[PDB]
Amino acid sequence: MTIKPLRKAVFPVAGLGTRFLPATKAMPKEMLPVVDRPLIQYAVDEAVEAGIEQMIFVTGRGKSALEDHFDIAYELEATMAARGKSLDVLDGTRLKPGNIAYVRQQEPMGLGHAVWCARDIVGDEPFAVLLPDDFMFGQPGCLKQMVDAYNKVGGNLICAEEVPDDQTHRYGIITPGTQDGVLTEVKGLVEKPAPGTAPSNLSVIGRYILQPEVMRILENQGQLTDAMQRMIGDQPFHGVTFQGTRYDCGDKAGFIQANLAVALSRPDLEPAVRAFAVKALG
Amino acid sequence: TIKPLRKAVFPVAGLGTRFLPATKAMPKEMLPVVDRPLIQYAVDEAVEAGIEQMIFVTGRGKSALEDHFDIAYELEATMAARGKSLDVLDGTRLKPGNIAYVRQQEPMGLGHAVWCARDIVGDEPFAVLLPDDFMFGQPGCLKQMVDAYNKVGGNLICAEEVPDDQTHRYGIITPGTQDGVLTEVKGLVEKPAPGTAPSNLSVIGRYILQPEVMRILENQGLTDAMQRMIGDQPFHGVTFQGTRYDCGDKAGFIQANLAVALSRPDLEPAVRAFAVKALG
Amino acid sequence: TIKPLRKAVFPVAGLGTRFLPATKAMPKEMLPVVDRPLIQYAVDEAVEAGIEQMIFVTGRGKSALEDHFDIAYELEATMAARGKSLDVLDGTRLKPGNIAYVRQQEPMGLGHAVWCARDIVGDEPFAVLLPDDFMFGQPGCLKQMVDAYNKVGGNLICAEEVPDDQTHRYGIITPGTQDGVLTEVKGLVEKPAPGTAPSNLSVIGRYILQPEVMRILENQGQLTDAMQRMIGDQPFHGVTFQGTRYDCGDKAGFIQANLAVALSRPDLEPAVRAFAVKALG
Amino acid sequence: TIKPLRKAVFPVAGLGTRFLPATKAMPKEMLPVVDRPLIQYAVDEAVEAGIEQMIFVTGRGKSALEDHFDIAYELEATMAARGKSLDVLDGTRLKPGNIAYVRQQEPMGLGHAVWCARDIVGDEPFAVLLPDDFMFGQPGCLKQMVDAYNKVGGNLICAEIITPGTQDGVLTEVNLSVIGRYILQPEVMRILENQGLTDAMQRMIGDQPFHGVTFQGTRYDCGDKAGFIQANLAVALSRPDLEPAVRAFAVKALG
Numbered sequence A: 001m002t003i004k005p006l007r008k009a010v011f012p013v014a015g016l017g018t019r020f021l022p023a024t025k026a027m028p029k030e031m032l033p034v035v036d037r038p039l040i041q042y043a044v045d046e047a048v049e050a051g052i053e054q055m056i057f058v059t060g061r062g063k064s065a066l067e068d069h070f071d072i073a074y075e076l077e078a079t080m081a082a083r084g085k086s087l088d089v090l091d092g093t094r095l096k097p098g099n100i101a102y103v104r105q106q107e108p109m110g111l112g113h114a115v116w117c118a119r120d121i122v123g124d125e126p127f128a129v130l131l132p133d134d135f136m137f138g139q140p141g142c143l144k145q146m147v148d149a150y151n152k153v154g155g156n157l158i159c160a161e162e163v164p165d166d167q168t169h170r171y172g173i174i175t176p177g178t179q180d181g182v183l184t185e186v187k188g189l190v191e192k193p194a195p196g197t198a199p200s201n202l203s204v205i206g207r208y209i210l211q212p213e214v215m216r217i218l219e220n221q222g223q224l225t226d227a228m229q230r231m232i233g234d235q236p237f238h239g240v241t242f243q244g245t246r247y248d249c250g251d252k253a254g255f256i257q258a259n260l261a262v263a264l265s266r267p268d269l270e271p272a273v274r275a276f277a278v279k280a281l282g
Numbered sequence B: 001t002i003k004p005l006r007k008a009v010f011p012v013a014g015l016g017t018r019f020l021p022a023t024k025a026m027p028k029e030m031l032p033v034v035d036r037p038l039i040q041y042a043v044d045e046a047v048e049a050g051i052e053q054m055i056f057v058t059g060r061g062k063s064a065l066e067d068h069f070d071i072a073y074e075l076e077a078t079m080a081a082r083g084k085s086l087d088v089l090d091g092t093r094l095k096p097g098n099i100a101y102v103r104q105q106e107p108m109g110l111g112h113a114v115w116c117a118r119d120i121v122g123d124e125p126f127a128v129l130l131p132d133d134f135m136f137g138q139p140g141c142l143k144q145m146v147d148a149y150n151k152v153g154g155n156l157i158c159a160e161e162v163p164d165d166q167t168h169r170y171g172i173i174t175p176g177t178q179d180g181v182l183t184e185v186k187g188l189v190e191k192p193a194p195g196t197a198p199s200n201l202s203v204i205g206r207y208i209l210q211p212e213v214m215r216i217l218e219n220q221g222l223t224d225a226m227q228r229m230i231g232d233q234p235f236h237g238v239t240f241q242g243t244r245y246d247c248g249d250k251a252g253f254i255q256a257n258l259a260v261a262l263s264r265p266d267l268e269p270a271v272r273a274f275a276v277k278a279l280g
Numbered sequence C: 001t002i003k004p005l006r007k008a009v010f011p012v013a014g015l016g017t018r019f020l021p022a023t024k025a026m027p028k029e030m031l032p033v034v035d036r037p038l039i040q041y042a043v044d045e046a047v048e049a050g051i052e053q054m055i056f057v058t059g060r061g062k063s064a065l066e067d068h069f070d071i072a073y074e075l076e077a078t079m080a081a082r083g084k085s086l087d088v089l090d091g092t093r094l095k096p097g098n099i100a101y102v103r104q105q106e107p108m109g110l111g112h113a114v115w116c117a118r119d120i121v122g123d124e125p126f127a128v129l130l131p132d133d134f135m136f137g138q139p140g141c142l143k144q145m146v147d148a149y150n151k152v153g154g155n156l157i158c159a160e161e162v163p164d165d166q167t168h169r170y171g172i173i174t175p176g177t178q179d180g181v182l183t184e185v186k187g188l189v190e191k192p193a194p195g196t197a198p199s200n201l202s203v204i205g206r207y208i209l210q211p212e213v214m215r216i217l218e219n220q221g222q223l224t225d226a227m228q229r230m231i232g233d234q235p236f237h238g239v240t241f242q243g244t245r246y247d248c249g250d251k252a253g254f255i256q257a258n259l260a261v262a263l264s265r266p267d268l269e270p271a272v273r274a275f276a277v278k279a280l281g
Numbered sequence D: 001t002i003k004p005l006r007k008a009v010f011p012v013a014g015l016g017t018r019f020l021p022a023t024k025a026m027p028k029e030m031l032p033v034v035d036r037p038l039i040q041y042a043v044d045e046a047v048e049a050g051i052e053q054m055i056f057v058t059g060r061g062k063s064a065l066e067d068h069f070d071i072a073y074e075l076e077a078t079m080a081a082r083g084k085s086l087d088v089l090d091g092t093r094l095k096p097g098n099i100a101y102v103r104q105q106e107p108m109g110l111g112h113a114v115w116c117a118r119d120i121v122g123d124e125p126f127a128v129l130l131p132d133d134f135m136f137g138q139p140g141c142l143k144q145m146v147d148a149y150n151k152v153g154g155n156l157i158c159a160e161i162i163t164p165g166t167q168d169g170v171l172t173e174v175n176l177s178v179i180g181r182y183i184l185q186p187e188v189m190r191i192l193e194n195q196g197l198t199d200a201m202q203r204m205i206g207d208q209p210f211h212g213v214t215f216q217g218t219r220y221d222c223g224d225k226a227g228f229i230q231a232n233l234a235v236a237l238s239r240p241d242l243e244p245a246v247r248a249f250a251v252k253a254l255g
């Protein structure tokens, strides 16, 4: 009757990313690069830093690239070796065998259904959920900051962020309680409220740490927000504000902004990129 | 007590070099015995045995095994546009999440492959099926084995008497008491030298193992693991009520295709007719 | 002046619905007869016939067909690491460029498929091979055909006598003069109705056509119906294969082909024959 | 006269090691410049220049390039089910047969790559486009080049290391960094076959008109990360729906 550690994270990667066509008509959206790494790469790096040791990808149909990316690139590594090029550039692209599991979603039925797909791999253990479109820039990574708070309050946690009024109908909204620094009690939550019925402004961001009871609730109704809801009254539920900036690579403008931000932070790229940005701006 | 099954591991990361050039760019596990691939048969067998979580330990060029168990979108659409029943595909798709894939990364054998499923299995007994061992019969091999499991528990493996000159190719069992279909395993040696075989009953690619076996594998990180397990838990060999075809070998693959074909009402007539002629 | 033969078209975009579930996610052209995929036998055949440009018109889920004819990097490296000879793969890789692929995009049949190779063929004669028609024998179907082509020229197709209740499934030929292995085609109808068959010699998946046939296909923007318009002005003969053909298009044929080849293999025949008789009563 | 020009060769078999780990399992030719992958821009450029036959010489892990130019069955179905227009995909797929693929098999460089298309091109003039060289401008590099072709014929290359002679405005008889845009005569194929590299186009200077064309626009070397980012920023600033937010961010982020 103990409580297990969270050595697990679930990555919903079965979307058709229709917003980025034509680029995504044959390329997984999750594979779009922020400078030189694909969105999922950042996401799993984040998880590793947070101490997670079992990544479980719930995929779709045309996404083999996601699978190959985290395996040995046999010919590539051979080619590089034949050129004295170091494989350090691939550090972190491959985990221990078994640490990355895949399960097909089969039918595109949303986030809750997706998480539900991992039910048997998670078991009676708390688990994390990361939506790669939410590029979280900062140190430590969002998940690590979150796990840090988990270690002290336990229960369920989600990344929270103040959003403009005309933006509230696009996210799940939190009904805030007591604030204790970075944490803030969630007294309620509604998935995309109507534009006049927003309980507040702090929305839910694609970073979660949930207790196994949430899986159970999903199996039973067998969606997510409504499932976390059912667990306000009996388990610690807090919103965590990220010490860094988040870029919504879900929309083209964010994607570009993220690329720029990261490039400006790179020793070898900022000089050239800065110089160019400057002129190009008038 | 005897913890219930429901989890099966399928090692499918081999390069099947024996079937080249057929397996040069296609998974050996996908070779058809008439009209269904070897894994399909193995999965069906698991389903019948009450297993509800398939764990595939794959290799690099094997996306076909993945697509085979998902919805074939365009195909199903084209069949519907021709009033063709999709019943032909029943059993091809399981519930979302019931089939998990993990990459073996490096081909280091059976033990290593099974080891790759450690976190998915957990504490929990698990089954292991090698699709190359085509098990023809009813009920299926795994079902017959699980029936014996719910009675004796512990670890079980499929056993089969093999000719003398063939013993050096299998793991051999040192038999104890026989109770109908079961036979106690008092010891086992992987591929003994010819003249050194303790007996003739070898190990076949069908296993039901206790979680302590995974533990022993993580620790040594193969056949040698099952054995640090004889004085502690009931360990029996099960004889299959049916015939097994070694599709690991060219001749076996063909024999299997012939056998199944002859059991098919719509194929038997034509096949038998030809077989006879062609034989002289 | 007979245009030399140097190109072959392989229609490999079918969904092989007949072999489900085996063909649910695997190209039917990759089904093996003992050792080698159907398409491998087909290209072998073309190579023997002196063809040096294979042109595959494929579909959507058929990357295996493309990988099969390229270097299998990891595999060849692993075999080398085990002193295993790569001879087993001889013929699986041709010279760079000798195999071209074009996507059919939509499954509109054989004529459409061949039409897709129009700009690759151009103004030159071309062959057409349907891998489902496993041609067992030697020299080998295309070779035997090209031998006849080199003396008669024009257009040729493999012809085979088929049972009466089987005629409605093939294109049927109206035979003329027979000159040994050849037989003039005076006409042909695609799948005639049962009772309407002009004869019994059907068209088999092996063709040698003149560029004018492409022209006619481009204009009509089907196959059978186009070869027709080429009767009164280009030598058109049907060729009989010196060997046996297996219709791997249907399950029984696939099985039969596998058994036939197996029995011709010194290393497999003993075990296979022994089994065959026992399991047969 | 001058044999028109209806064929283009696209060398797309590189391992893009410079963009690791992004290109570990994804073709570098598929890297997006905001909305579309590099090859898309390249083929669009070709179509605008009147090219009717695209020939891709690919490598091993590059199925994405093939699927991209075919019908995305399930996707188009899903969009339809959402009343979303497919115009977003216009230019994504050409007439069947207009895109041919040949495997390079062995990574032996540009010359060998072009050589692989020898039998598809035949005795005809052909273009060559390296998608890493993102050519931003209107009417687009190949078009501008083809315009000069119909006048002078022979062989042309995009210029921006070469020594010149006479400058006829945009043309200049052969700095001038050579750029990945070529229009070559069939005799160059023959010379490649024989020695069986590119600087063998030179064995073609005393017999055919050979000029360098200067591009009316700017080129971004998406071969290196700085260039890739610059290209994405430039295009974004040119898009009415993205420029506002992108510019506002850029400014703030720059200090």
Ligand SMILES: O=P(O)(O)O[C@H]1O[C@H](CO)[C@@H](O)[C@H](O)[C@H]1O
Pocket (backbone or CB within 6 Å): A111, A131, A134, A170, A171, A172, A173, A191, A192, A203, A204, A205, A206, A225
């Ligand atoms: O992004 P989705 O899938 O449209 O919506 C999901 O993630 C959002 C954050 O990105 C949350 O605010 C929503 O509550 C959640 O349902």
Ligand SMILES: O=P(O)(O)O[C@H]1O[C@H](CO)[C@@H](O)[C@H](O)[C@H]1O
Pocket (backbone or CB within 6 Å): B110, B130, B133, B169, B170, B171, B202, B203, B204, B205, B223
């Ligand atoms: O097939 P392998 O790898 O030579 O040997 C493996 O499968 C055999 C059955 O096929 C088992 O009897 C062996 O114990 C196992 O190690």
Ligand SMILES: O=P(O)(O)O[C@H]1O[C@H](CO)[C@@H](O)[C@H](O)[C@H]1O
Pocket (backbone or CB within 6 Å): C110, C130, C133, C169, C170, C171, C172, C190, C191, C202, C203, C204, C205, C223, C224
């Ligand atoms: O096989 P298909 O495409 O159904 O039909 C095609 O090949 C047959 C032989 O296999 C010929 O008899 C038909 O005339 C030809 O159109």
Ligand SMILES: O=P(O)(O)O[C@H]1O[C@H](CO)[C@@H](O)[C@H](O)[C@H]1O
Pocket (backbone or CB within 6 Å): D110, D130, D132, D133, D178, D179, D180, D223
């Ligand atoms: O990559 P290569 O073949 O060494 O060089 C090639 O690509 C370069 C861009 O990457 C171009 O600037 C060169 O003109 C072209 O020949």
